[PDB]
Structure 1
């Protein structure tokens, strides 16, 4: 079918799209078609519903009518406020997840989280020492953890002048943020202040609103996300390189298949633990299954891949299709990017849809709420639900369409530095000599507007062919993995210089660096390189790209990349083109301010050209050859 082929580049998606159509199951692509054409005011950002003097919409009329909202706000203010609330929603998604990790570490330090422990005490002591805990190297581990918990909680308070992890950024960058009024002060505070600013009759200057949007995004990348990443490593282990597999073929007909979906590994790590208990495996054996098979979706999947090597079934637009295989016996959901259509599609099969978070409630789901104090008991109950659902699987509707594709994962900054012999000096030498011309983090989602992973893969291929190493996170991980680019043998697909460095280190030309919160690892790496070299992040030959983004979280990531000095490409524009001034700020004005700007470009080859041009300009300023 020409329509099905246009929706994705992948055979396993095509196969499930055919099956979904045969079984009369509507998908995200069908709902996207029903919502096309979309309201122009919504697309442009020129609609405001922030009070009930509205709704207001701004037209561009020669007679000057509908130029202002009822309160007098113009298109610049309305677009900038909508964009600011958009960013705040993304920052809040990461913020609340980082907050849950603080609470989990506190429960471990108090001895009130059965089955949880401090899996990386060495990293605990290092992070705590970095952030100022006294005698972190020698004091009892749970005392050090309690002091680290206090520091992280204080970043979720209202008394700091700068977040704790901001000290990683080079001095020149912290000085610039301070001069601009961009320094993030409190993770929750910046979000709340954004909501205040965007109330009627508060902030009515688009420049001020966009500056606070940058501050709010920075409070995510250097706060909520960075806390989430570093505490997740302490609690569940620091990733090291390991082999795994990707695509819908990681599901197994002869096993109980449990898909974990969402973002929080506090649940997924304990689901995986329950599946390895002897009594639970005997229950699955008694039900007729040969094994219990956990596979990942989206950022929870990314996390379990990085730390445990658990195979990833799919990214964002694969999620519905994973149920359409007929082999998903349970989906275990926590929060964020979990499409509620999955509840309805699961009900078309035997699949249990289990929610675990008080924040991730879905009408019609089976709710088994999980907290650290009860996770071990509750996750056992959830796996037994999956085994029970397995006994009702209709064997005639099972169609697992592909063989899995080998990948390598687990490239934390700790693993990267270890692969380099302990210092970044071999990486700096490679960049100075021009073997690696630069690095681009390719991050972000799928979006039904773009043929799934078409831009993600094309951009990745173009960059590695030009000797630009790619750092992959989020739903790009699955795209690079299915493309065969996440293995060391993929050096044959890179340019001569990048292939040579990859082969000498034994690593792929694309490094999987984790989930969306793990984009904080990319900030940390950039900050380490700039600090080592004595330059700003805006002087490094780096870039970031989200070719197929959709979420507020992805927009917040892009904003904190830009605000930190990383040129950032987006495949689709945010809803801001209704204001030329806001658009010009985002694409050009920010360059004058933070040393980076957004680029919007749906042609991935042209996106590669633009990212490469920035890298080459920055190499020249460093006195390097290109």
Structure 2
């Protein structure tokens, strides 16, 4: 089982699933081998009913699509659609919070409110929305209106791109026509230009992909902005992770998916239904996190993370998961059938994300507290039904220090320099105590032993004094392996990085250091890393493509991950991906994305499946940036 997952809790549940006959994600993968080579290389097109068309990577015919579409067009078209799909998920998430915020301050849904007034006013200022003399509800109305306005064409480009990157970066992108005109506008244009008989030039197609990836960035940043207004900007918090956070004697409720509009309410309402769970024989209601909705409520509330990504089914296999409350994205639809075996009540809540065999509860903000209690009552019902059935919770969990929003990082650094808080970080980059910055982002992928690339790469970078930050299921990986516990700083961190984490921690009154990896939140909160990196760029007076900052989608899976990796490249970052995207079928496309794009945006993809090699390549990328700034390395 260590070939399936490096996580010992997951291993334990895989043995349980095997003796019980419950098929897993790993079993379905084995049954899919060998996977289709045309798909894997990207040399397959089904964009019209003349297909499927495929192209032999090598050999004789077929060499070209029926309509004349070459390998390089086919590959670029498939990649563009995946970016557009990722953008559609992140911007749909954001759009929904915009409507939620609009409803809140119009009196429609009193369960929602402006919780972070500072953030609301700073977003308004960033957007140009007057705040002087306005009521908060009216500024917030203007911010939600502006959020919704960025989805379509208008007299301005997308403001959640042009106001969040340095003018120098916006100018670079504008010269190449890469600023998005509207978020859903770019999604649609991709689907059009990639449809049969339209765009058939690889460079033109990929320029479209870059622009649509910036539409995805805009949705990410909008989602983080709006969720912070509504639910509070994260600050440092201590909690726990992995399956051992499940409690046999409690009603265990997993919140799973991406958008926290529901599960933030679940968190608060659960705390009151406490005596009602006690009446059913439980100690209380134990909300635990799965995937990015879990990250959201861990970041803000310290809700413990149960598991992540590829291993999500394993939470159910314990026998103690009474309820799994779903919104959308990254939810294995196998969960609905596994619940038949495990007794877990699986509940969908979003109209466009249903799963056959799951109970649906039609969430509406206007009734959130009521929907919350209906769900938690179904969970209390399931806890009652497993009286006297033994459970198998692996007694395995890690301590997790999380909550490092960009505002939190700046405040933590402010304790070392009050009026210039980025300077202590830059100082230590210059002097070498911090070699660079690496953002780990993205999913697990069944093709990679779970977490093996994240932990292998992170270990090698931390030993070389790289400041490591993490979001989404990359942060999930690192937390489950102890990388967010400050007691592991001695083991994991190089001397210089240890010195910096220690200095910052001691100055924030904790007598111990910051944890080895900084948890910056969910997938949309990759926008927070952009905020930090752009603030560094502006404080230094250079563009992002001169900074010793890189990103790693070390175990990428979702179309969202492809979109993030692409806008990481587009804002100027060297960007590693540890799984093969479907591009190897075209050398010209590969060469654009890993080399030529450097001359456009300054960033580039680093495709490397071997994690020890990937780290060496990321460190060379960091050290090249150091050398370009005239720093020792």
- TM-score, normalised with respect to structure 2: 0.96
Aligned length: 618
- Large movers: runs of 4+ above 3 Å: 60-63, 394-397
Contact 1:247 1:478 in 2 (8 A): no
For residues 396-411 of structure 1, what are the structure 2 equivalents within 5 Å?
396-411=389-404
- Does the residue aligned with 1:265 lie in a helix, a strand or coil? coil
> Could you tell me how far apart the structure 2 residues matched to 1:477 and 1:395 are?
36
Which residue does the alignment assign to 1:148? 143
CA distance in 1, matches of 2:388, 2:585: 52
Q: Which residue of 2 aligns with 1:302?
A: 295
Mapped contact 1:298–1:474 kept (Cα < 8 A): yes
2:90 paired residue number: 94
Task: State how far apart, in whole Å, the 1-side matches of 2:388 and 2:586 are.
Answer: 54
Deviation at 1:469, TM superposition (A): 0.8
C-alpha contact (below 8 Å) 2:440/2:474 kept by paired residues: yes
Match of 1:430 among 428, 431, 441: 428
1:587 aligned residue = 594
- Cα distance, 1:596 vs. partner? 1.2
> How high is the TM-score relative to the length of structure 1?
0.97
Deviation larger for 230-239 or 39-48: 39-48
Which stretch shows the higher mean deviation, 235-244 or 523-532?
Answer: 523-532
Contact 1:541 1:619 in 2 (8 A): yes
Q: State the secondary structure of the residue aligned to 2:253.
A: strand
Q: Is the counterpart of residue 36 in structure 1 residue 33 in structure 2?
A: yes
CA-atom RMSD, angstroms?
1.2
Q: Which of these residues, 181, 184, 192, is aligned with residue 185 of structure 1? A: 181
Which residue in 1 is equivalent to 2:508? none
C-alpha distance in 2 between matches for 1:503 and 1:176: 38
Partner of 1:272: 267
Q: 1:294 Cα deviation (Å)?
A: 0.1
Does the C-alpha gap of structure 1 residues 208 and 312 become closer, same or farther in structure 2, counting only changes over 3 Å? same
Matched residue, 2:369? 376
Deviations for 1:134-192, whole angstroms, at most 9, x for unmatched residues?
1x154211011001111111101211442213223122211111111111221111101
8 Å CA contact 1:488, 1:503 repeated in 2: no
Query: Which SS does the other structure have where 2:321 is aligned?
Result: coil
8 A contact 2:575–2:605 mirrored in 1: yes
Structure 1 residue 487, shift from structure 2 partner: 2.4
Secondary structure in 2 aligned to 1:168? coil
1:397-439 C-alpha deviation (Å, 9 max, x unpaired)? 4100123210100000010000011521111111111111100
* Match of residue 554 from structure 2: 547
Contact 2:246 2:286 (C-alpha < 8 Å) held by counterparts: yes
Deviates more, 1:327-336 or 1:387-396: 387-396
Alignment partner for residue 15 of structure 1, among 12, 17, 25?
A: 12
The aligned counterpart of 2:496 is 497
SS at match of 1:6: coil
Cα offset, 1:61, TM superposition: 6.4
SS of residue in 1 equivalent to 2:3: helix
Contact 1:28 1:448 in 2 (8 A): yes
Partner of 2:313: 320
The aligned residue for residue 359 of structure 1 is 352
**1:169–1:531 Cα contact (<8 Å) kept:** no
Alignment of 1:481-560 (within 5 A): 481-492=479-490, 493-506=492-505, 507-560=514-567
Q: Counterparts in 2 of 1:386-405, with a 5 A limit?
A: 386-393=379-386, 395-405=388-398
Moved more, 465-474 or 51-60: 51-60
Is 2:124 the partner of 1:131? no
1:56-135 to structure 2, matched below 5 A, reads: 56-59=53-56, 65-134=61-130
**CA offset digits 1:495-553 (Å, max 9, x no partner):** 11100000011112210000000001111111111111111100000000011111100
Structure 2 stretches lacking a partner, 5+ long: 506-513
- Displacement of 1:317: 1.8
Contact 2:224 2:524 in 1 (8 A): yes
